[PDB]
Amino acid sequence: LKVIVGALIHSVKKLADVTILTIFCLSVFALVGLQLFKGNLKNKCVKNDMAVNETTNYSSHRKPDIYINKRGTSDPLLCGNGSDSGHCPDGYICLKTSDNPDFNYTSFDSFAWAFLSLFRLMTQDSWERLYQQTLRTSGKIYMIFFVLVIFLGSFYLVNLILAVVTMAYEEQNQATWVKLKTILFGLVTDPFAELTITLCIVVNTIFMAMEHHGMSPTFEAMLQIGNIVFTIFFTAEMVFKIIAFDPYYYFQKKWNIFDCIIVTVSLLELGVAKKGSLSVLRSFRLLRVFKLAKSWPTLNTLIKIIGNSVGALGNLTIILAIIVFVFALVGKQLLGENYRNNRKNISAPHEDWPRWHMHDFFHSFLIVFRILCGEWIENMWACMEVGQKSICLILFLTVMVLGNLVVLNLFIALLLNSFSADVGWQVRKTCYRIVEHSWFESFIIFMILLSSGSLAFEDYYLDQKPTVKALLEYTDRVFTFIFVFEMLLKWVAYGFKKYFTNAWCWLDFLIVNISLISLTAKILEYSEVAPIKALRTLRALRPLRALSRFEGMRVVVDALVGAIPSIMNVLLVCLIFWLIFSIMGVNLFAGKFWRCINYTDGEFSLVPLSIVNNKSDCKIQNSTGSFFWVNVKVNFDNVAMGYLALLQVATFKGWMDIMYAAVDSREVNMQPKWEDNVYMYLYFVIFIIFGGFFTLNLFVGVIIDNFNQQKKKLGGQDIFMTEEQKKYYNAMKKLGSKKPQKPIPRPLNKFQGFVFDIVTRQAFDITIMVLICLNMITMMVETDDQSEEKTKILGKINQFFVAVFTGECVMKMFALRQYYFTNGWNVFDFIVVVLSIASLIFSAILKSLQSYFSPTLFRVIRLARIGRILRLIRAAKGIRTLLFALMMSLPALFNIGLLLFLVMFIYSIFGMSSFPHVRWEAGIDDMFNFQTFANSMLCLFQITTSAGWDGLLSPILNTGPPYCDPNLPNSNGTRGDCGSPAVGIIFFTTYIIISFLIVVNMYIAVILENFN
Amino acid sequence: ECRYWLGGCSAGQTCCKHLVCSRRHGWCVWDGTFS
Ligand SMILES: *[C@@H]1O[C@H](CO)[C@@H](O[C@@H]2O[C@H](CO)[C@@H](O[C@@H]3O[C@H](CO)[C@@H](O)[C@H](O)[C@@H]3O)[C@H](O)[C@H]2NC(C)=O)[C@H](O)[C@H]1NC(C)=O
Ligand SMILES: *[C@@H]1O[C@H](CO)[C@@H](O[C@@H]2O[C@H](CO)[C@@H](O[C@@H]3O[C@H](CO)[C@@H](O)[C@H](O)[C@@H]3O)[C@H](O)[C@H]2NC(C)=O)[C@H](O)[C@H]1NC(C)=O
Ligand SMILES: *[C@@H]1O[C@H](CO)[C@@H](O[C@@H]2O[C@H](CO)[C@@H](O[C@@H]3O[C@H](CO)[C@@H](O)[C@H](O)[C@@H]3O)[C@H](O)[C@H]2NC(C)=O)[C@H](O)[C@H]1NC(C)=O
Ligand SMILES: CCCCCCCCCCCCCCCCCCOC[C@@H](O)COP(=O)(O)OCC[N+](C)(C)C
Ligand SMILES: CC(C)CCC[C@@H](C)[C@H]1CC[C@H]2[C@@H]3CC=C4C[C@@H](O)CC[C@]4(C)[C@H]3CC[C@]12C
Ligand SMILES: CC(C)CCC[C@@H](C)[C@H]1CC[C@H]2[C@@H]3CC=C4C[C@@H](O)CC[C@]4(C)[C@H]3CC[C@]12C
Ligand SMILES: CC(C)CCC[C@@H](C)[C@H]1CC[C@H]2[C@@H]3CC=C4C[C@@H](O)CC[C@]4(C)[C@H]3CC[C@]12C
Ligand SMILES: CC(C)CCC[C@@H](C)[C@H]1CC[C@H]2[C@@H]3CC=C4C[C@@H](O)CC[C@]4(C)[C@H]3CC[C@]12C
């Protein structure tokens, strides 16, 4: 047992420092959340008796809680009194209720609730829900807490966990018969021989990609005769190569035995099976794309990735499946009866069952798969509601902890075992000196940064701000004119060839062009035509000039462009591996998504099976003008819609809405029935395993080895860093390399004599550390519904601890003579004991009622005690080292973060204009919309982690009633309140991909700065 | 008539169990259950 004990201690030791840092940072941010947010989740829009009553209207007051549910959901609308909070509708007041959202489980009102909320924010599990609730109640300007806890903790700590796993493996690797005439007549090998087969596969897959829901019978006949012709072609090729080759030699090879299986399936289904959910076998012909792997090195790499998963690393891919199945077994046996009995509590209002249960063994496997995909909070809420809370808590976290690590561990293992093995000339010189001057660079950067910021103010409310419109209109005109003149100056100074062979001055040639055609169209006629509107929407990419005029921006873009061929190759291989699933899903679910609903109050009710079964039933039961035959917005109805559905399934956003429609689908024109095709969940589990794990592993590996190649080619850290930033990096390394220290001259004089010794004592420092520990637990035990007796005690203890800290700081200032100020961490202690003093004094002054004293300002000021626990970084050497690595990465992190902020700004200015009038449906709220720049930035920060992009795109996908309203009296601009489908698709897909790229850039930067 | 997993049919009759004839080309297949 000593061997397994050593294995366990090593396994924890590799993750010991990162785990301690995770728990410490999570506890600190839990304290921050508790202190700033507490009770604001109990802020429901409780109604008042607005109309007067002759007699008392509070006779009972037992059930006066007239809540108002949020439009499109069965959840009460949250609110806040702050100016930046969410405001109640007319006739309602915001009140402190006694219930938190999400079955009274999502709250910041206590230590444990805050810890769970911060853990969920770390794991990113529907964090945009906690984020939208908190910004609904506390206020928009509190988005800063979420940015801090997303960029740090979540992003950085996932980086640290991933790098710890990678370091542990790499360590592990370091430790490591007249017919013979007809037979030879064959001669299959020929010019264009295998390339006539490759072309046939390409054309056949292109045929299959043209199947859709609304296809003419002639089109379907033409698409079936083509499939018949290609079956004939493949059968021909097979028999003609059987006769040409020897009876054993042909079937000796797996690449010919693969075609044998494919063609025998194509024969034994196209005539021995119907398409009664068996169109998947009709889609077995798509599997012939494996042939192109010989001419496609990246496709061969992906095939080798899958094989290594099933081959040498089968030892770890059999562990994944077996732990999933064991979790499923235990979960079903423990909670299926509770799920069945109490399904009434966790079901939708119109369903007898919840969508996600653990009743069967299939559904328990499915919830375990969802957990490993990274969605556990909602199912944990339902599972805690129905079954025992302690048993539910243990299972869901254990599956999330063990299940996610082994997926990452096998991801890393697969990432190394499959990837590492005259007057004119006078004027020309004048222009040269003018444009090369030091007052022509800082001026242009300032102007670029004032053309950026000027775009943020052109919002929906710009109509309500009349003078701001003219101000912005003439700050844009003058800026574009000055940019045009600056470009003309550069043209006069340098050569046209020197201009046109640069990778940046072209970018700004294009921005100048779009701005100059926009203004020219505005001056001239046709300014109100759709092409000119399209040209004027492109003004959001003007901030790309700061991408050229800043050296860090130049460096980061050049670094990412150095990997453009690898990126494009992986894009091509991923795209076509996803084409197989797109066509397969289209064949499975093409046209089977539509359904009838009841449109009552912006709340859609699925008509029950008894009254409606058909597109024709739903219409013969259209007594009230509220029965609507509508399609699910993300459908497998075309190849394009199929791929937007595949992207949503891979990104795990919009995932459930597709998994439900596909599974419930019975047939075409026939009403969906609950779990009629319950085994389409297996289909989705197979496109997520393959088009998720394996394509992502291929992309990672390819990007890593491109960046490693560039790093070893340059032999320098300046992949993303600058020259001055490299010097600053050297300065920071020197700070870290400062191992020797000068011993302090002990004060010989009696004053400070024994004081210095008692201060520099190990007993003294351990006492201060444990005192910090008690103080941490003291501010940790602080609940919302607390007695005034409890608040007084907490304030008294806070004052005592502040006094003790001030005494220690003054004692060190006295005994240690300016060598206290010599040390940086001692300086941090001094500043965090002068901030605690200032916060206490300010709280006392405000409590004297000098003016209005909002409790939120008291909470903000009370955050100043965060230093008293941030002082504990010294006590943990591992935490100190990881924080030092973070500080080391801050140059490159700042560069790539500024690139990400620039892309956020560009997409924000895009959204502010393309989508202000879209109706609030699922993720768009009065707050989280694209009518003002702050709201746009809230949405874009949210979807930079790809969270809620389905919710923010579904209102865009609306094209008519009952979901939206063409011809709405107000908001006449965007055809009422219906979104542009193609524009929204391009926006959200390109944004999530482009930021997936830039986040991978930050991830690899942090990891390679941790290696050094 | 009643051709099990042969892809026959092509006539005015159907096939017995889990078997129905098809559209376009006339073949009766194991549509009801597995072949
Ligand atoms: C799942 O849902 C059922 C039904 O919605 C819940 O049953 C309800 O449980 C509560 C709490 O025990 C009952 O209230 C109490 O009931 C009795 C009097 O009937 C008494 O102990 C108390 O005065 C109190 O009113 C409630 O009556 C009961 N409702 C029904 C319709 O049975 C159940 O608690 C939920 N359980 C889970 C595990 O989700
Ligand atoms: C969905 O499918 C079709 C429309 O696509 C609906 O067809 C209707 O089916 C009902 C019930 O089978 C037929 O009623 C019939 O009436 C008499 C006496 O009851 C008798 O012939 C049958 O026993 C049957 O009950 C009705 O005529 C038929 N309508 C047509 C053919 O136009 C069907 O109801 C829809 N829903 C379901 C649940 O099948
Ligand atoms: C049951 O009857 C109601 C009441 O007429 C039907 O609602 C109507 O649905 C159609 C098709 O969705 C709507 O037409 C479309 O509306 C807009 C312009 O309003 C535009 O997208 C299209 O050009 C088209 O005209 C119609 O406006 C809508 N009317 C109302 C009052 O809601 C409903 O479709 C019927 N249910 C079924 C299952 O047929
Ligand atoms: C944040 C994601 C988007 C970032 C990029 C957006 C802006 C694109 C421009 C970025 C600047 C860097 C791109 C290129 C870096 C690679 C290095 C610079 O690229 C040089 C190419 O422009 C020309 O390539 P050649 O030198 O092979 O051919 C010269 C042919 N002429 C021009 C002499 C006739
Ligand atoms: C439930 C049904 C649909 C699943 C049946 C499997 C079908 C879908 C396909 C998917 C990928 C295929 C595999 C792909 C490649 C190889 C390697 C080859 O050397 C032997 C056949 C083998 C191992 C194939 C067997 C059949 C296979 C597993
Ligand atoms: C519907 C689909 C399958 C048919 C059209 C896809 C075509 C364009 C795909 C299929 C295979 C692909 C090729 C496979 C391999 C290579 C080798 C690489 O070094 C250059 C690109 C090249 C030559 C690819 C170009 C694009 C390609 C030809
Ligand atoms: C130093 C010891 C106490 C551990 C430090 C963690 C402390 C702060 C944790 C551990 C258990 C937690 C308590 C467990 C249960 C409850 C009941 C809840 O309705 C109010 C908060 C309260 C009382 C929690 C407050 C925070 C708490 C006391
Ligand atoms: C030269 C080879 C052996 C080095 C391999 C070890 C390092 C570089 C590898 C192993 C695992 C890799 C990480 C795997 C997962 C991710 C998350 C992904 O979204 C971006 C890339 C990123 C962040 C990779 C960065 C580089 C990485 C840490």
Author numbering:
A (entry chain A): 232 to 407, 651 to 895, 1136 to 1726
B (entry chain B): 1 to 35
What did the original publication write about this model?
Voltage-gated sodium channels (NaVs) selectively permit diffusion of sodium ions across the cell membrane and, in excitable cells, are responsible for propagating action potentials. Multiple studies have linked NaV1.8 to nociception and chronic pain. Here, we used mammalian HEK293 cells to express full-length human NaV1.8 and determined the structure, with and without ProTx-I bound, by single-particle cryoEM.
ProTx-I was isolated from the venom of the Peruvian green velvet tarantula (Thrixopelma pruriens) and is a gating-modifier peptide that shifts the voltage-dependence of activation to more depolarized potentials. Processing of the data produced a map with an overall resolution of 2.8 Å from 267,708 particles. Density for ProTx-I is clearly visible in the refined map; consistent with its electrophysiological effects as a gating modifier and previous structure-activity relationship studies, ProTx-I binds to the S3-S4 linker on VSDII. This redirection of the S3-S4 linker due to ProTx-I binding propagates along its length such that G750 and S751 now sit directly atop S4 and adjacent to the pore domain, potentially hindering translocation of S4. The higher resolution of this map, likely enabled by the stabilizing effect of ProTx-I, allowed an additional extracellular loop (ECLI, D280-P295) to be traced in the hNaV1.8-ProTx-I map that was not possible for apo-hNaV1.8. Despite high local resolution, we do not observe any density for ProTx-I above VSDIV in the hNaV1.8-ProTx-I structure, noting that the S1-S2 and S3-S4 linker regions on VSDIV are poorly conserved between hNaV1.7 and hNaV1.8.
